[PDB]
Each structure stands twice: as C-alpha cells, then as structure tokens.
C-alpha cells in the first residue's frame, strides 16, 4: 500500500470547501463560517491568530500554499492552537 495521496485529495477537497468564494484565498470570514457550521463558536481573535500563524506575508488572506504547508506541519510537526484544534477534531 503506502500509496498515500489521501492527503492531496483531502487537502484539495477541503481547501475547495473552505474557499466558498472560490477565489483561491481563504479569509477569516470563510474560516469563521466553517467553524460556526461545525457547531463551534470561536472569537475573531482565534481566527486572526490562525491567519497570522499561517500567513507569512500578513496579507489578511491565506493562500493554498500556506494551507498545504501549514497542514503538513501541524501533522506531526505541530502548529498554533487553532490549526491544531481543527487538525485534532478531524482525524485524531
Ligand atoms: Ca475567499
Ligand atoms: Ca498569506
């Protein structure tokens, strides 16, 4: 087995869902909407903190590249408290 890839489709599919606007850029607005829909009530501070951690250019928006790398790290590497919370409530 060890085929893997389950990440490519997972990250890609999820990313496509996160970016409702489909502009290729995730914003606190979309992130917050997803968190709320998940039955979670997080404050803007938590959302902003997540963007800052992932955002390396502080453009107020997270690009696909920032998402993939961030997801790759949080997986074994570890990230902030928000990303870890999402990556924790997901698989395990
Ligand atoms: Ca967007
Ligand atoms: Ca960014």
Number of independent structural domains in the chain: 1
Q: How many residues are present in the chain?
A: 92
Say how far apart CA 2 and CA 79 lie, in whole Å.
25
Distances in Å between the Cα of 65 and the Cα atoms of 24, 33, 42, 71 are: 10, 21, 24, 10
Residues 6+ apart with CB under 8 A from 59: none
| Ligand lying nearest the CA atom of residue 32 | 1
Bridge partner residues of 63 (DSSP): 25
Specify the DSSP element, H or E, that contains 10: helix 6-18
Report CA 8 to chain centroid distance, whole Å.
14
Quote the ligand 1 centre to 3 CA distance (angstroms): 31
Ligand with minimal distance to 53 CA: 2
Q: Cα of 79 to ligand 2 centre, how many Å?
A: 16
* Method of determination used here: NMR
Ligand nearest to the CA of 50: 2
Q: Which of 2, 4, 36 lies closest to 20 in space, CA to CA? A: 36
- CB-side exposure of 56: number of CA atoms within 13 Å? 7
Taking the centre of ligand 2 as the mean of its atom positions, its distance from the CA of residue 24, in whole angstroms, is 11
Domain range enclosing 58: 1-92
Q: How far is the CA of 64 from the centre of ligand 2 (A)?
A: 9
């Amino acid at each position: 087995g060890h085929m893997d890839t389950d990440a490519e489709e997972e990250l890609k599919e999820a990313f496509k869902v996160f970016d409702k606007d489909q502009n290729g850029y995730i914003s606190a607005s979309e992130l917050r909407h997803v968190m709320i829909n998940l039955g979670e009530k997080l404050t803007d501070e938590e959302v902003e903190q997540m963007i800052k951690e992932a955002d390396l250019d502080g453009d107020g928006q997270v690009n696909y590249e920032e998402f993939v790398k961030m997801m790759m790290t949080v997986r074994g590497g570890g990230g902030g408290n928000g990303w870890s919370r999402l990556r924790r409530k997901f698989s395990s």
